Design an enzyme around this catalytic site. Structure first.
Site, PDB file in Angstrom:
ATOM      1  N   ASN A 263       3.090  -0.538   1.456  1.00 51.81           N
ATOM      2  CA  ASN A 263       2.664   0.590   0.637  1.00 51.81           C
ATOM      3  C   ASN A 263       1.359   1.089   0.784  1.00 51.81           C
ATOM      4  OD1 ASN A 263       1.503  -1.982  -0.210  1.00 51.81           O
ATOM      5  ND2 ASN A 263       1.597  -1.517  -2.419  1.00 51.81           N
ATOM      6  N   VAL A 264       1.117   2.217   0.293  1.00 46.07           N
ATOM      7  CA  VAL A 264      -0.191   3.342   0.464  1.00 46.07           C
ATOM      8  C   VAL A 264      -0.544   3.572  -0.781  1.00 46.07           C
ATOM      9  CG1 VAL A 264      -1.558   4.803   1.855  1.00 46.07           C
ATOM     10  CG2 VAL A 264       0.423   3.517   2.898  1.00 46.07           C
ATOM     11  N   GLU A 265      -1.493   3.001  -1.403  1.00 41.86           N
ATOM     12  CA  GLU A 265      -1.863   3.687  -2.955  1.00 41.86           C
ATOM     13  C   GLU A 265      -2.835   4.635  -2.647  1.00 41.86           C
ATOM     14  OE1 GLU A 265      -3.393   0.112  -4.807  1.00 41.86           O
ATOM     15  OE2 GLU A 265      -1.348  -0.497  -5.584  1.00 41.86           O
TER      16      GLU A 265
ATOM     17  N   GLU B 102       8.833   1.133   0.517  1.00 42.93           N
ATOM     18  CA  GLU B 102      10.169   1.894   1.033  1.00 42.93           C
ATOM     19  C   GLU B 102      10.173   3.374   1.309  1.00 42.93           C
ATOM     20  OE1 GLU B 102       9.186  -0.170  -1.573  1.00 42.93           O
ATOM     21  OE2 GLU B 102      10.997  -0.993  -2.384  1.00 42.93           O
TER      22      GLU B 102
END
Ligand SMILES: [Zn+2]
Ligand SMILES: [Zn+2]
Ligand SMILES: [Zn+2]
Ligand SMILES: [Zn+2]
Lengths: 119, 119, 119, 119
Positions: B42-44, B55
């Site tokens: 994930n990349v916030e 995903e």
């Protein structure tokens, strides 16, 4: 910065895109501050709002390959013409490249701050 | 399907995540129908709603590496626990794996059909 | 629960949608636990991935009108046929209606837990 | 344009926000070309990337109330400070207000053209 080599990587990425709904494939490529290149292609979805821009894929690939900061960016459409990222993608680029990220546009290279001021 | 090897890949990807806002890294890994593995983390984003799930990055990597169909999927959090994709990511996986995609969960291996019926 | 009256509000919302890119307007309506009805319509964007589903608009309207919990939900397409929300929208509904939210589907009314297990 | 009245509306909308994950409520308000005001508040989600910005809800409300074009826009945080929309929301506002949309910022009233050139 070798802009023709970056644009070549973006056109190659564009050829891999999944855009059956719009028929509008996009590829992007960026130089990372360690010297490597990362790329992305757009991936559309039957629910349009879940589509991922090429820049989304590029930012995911930035961290999958070790992280770092973006220093140069280019995006191209299915005719190989240069595209300015949409507002969402400008915001992703700002987070990982900042105001001084160089962005390839059809009108010429621009710092990201000129494309997304006061971010 | 070598589920331990897939879980190891997801945990590897999780360690590369960009989650400074939640402090909640996530990694995912999937087997493609040609036999290769793709991963995502994930990349916030400072604007929370622009965050990319693991995903998302996995589907971006699927096409960046030449496309295909997903056949098996695993997602893990920062302590190695199996996670069930959120609804958005279930829809992304449905597009590229369909109802027969196998999803590694704490309740066992479940087909995506049972996690997102009538999609 | 007056399901025909809820479906009527959803079809009215569908008529207001902004869907020039797909030509696929969607309307949604929901009953809130205080008795009022809230509605949404989809709003597409030239950047496909920024499109908002009707359920997105419905959840925004839920809080703009005072908040609360959703108890019944229906979504319809441009032919007035019942639609099952996409995975992203199932996740939004789960947050504000939970597993026991009743969802109108073409196959019959279903609890949300039957459409998004283990959320 | 009555900017104080628009700011009051945005602050009203901000007080209705659903932001339990960040604790950062946001409200937005905009004048439509027919003269009415529309508002939005942010709605966060347990899956951060599914959060809706206040401007998302505002655009949803624009069409829920019959459509139109946006002419003036204000966004405020939980202490009443003027906020500049993120890049994603700049793109949403560009679709429905265009480069001439006036945006209320701490640097003064700025046209959207100056906040998102060449969109
Ligand atoms: Zn974009
Ligand atoms: Zn997700
Ligand atoms: Zn949806
Ligand atoms: Zn925003």
């Amino acid at each position: 910065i070798d802009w023709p080599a970056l644009r070549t990587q973006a056109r190659d990425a564009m050829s891999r895109a999944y855009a059956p709904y719009s028929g509008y494939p996009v590829g992007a490529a960026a130089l990372v501050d360690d010297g490597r290149t990362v790329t992305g292609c757009n991936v559309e979805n039957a629910s349009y709002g879940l589509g991922l821009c090429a820049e989304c894929g590029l930012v995911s690939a930035l961290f999958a390959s070790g992280g770092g900061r973006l220093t140069a960016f280019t995006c191209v459409d299915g005719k190989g013409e240069l595209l300015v990222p949409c507002g969402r993608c400008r915001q992703l680029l700002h987070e990982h490249g900042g105001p001084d990220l160089l962005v390839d546009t059809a009108a010429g290279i621009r710092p990201l701050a000129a494309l997304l001021p006061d971010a």
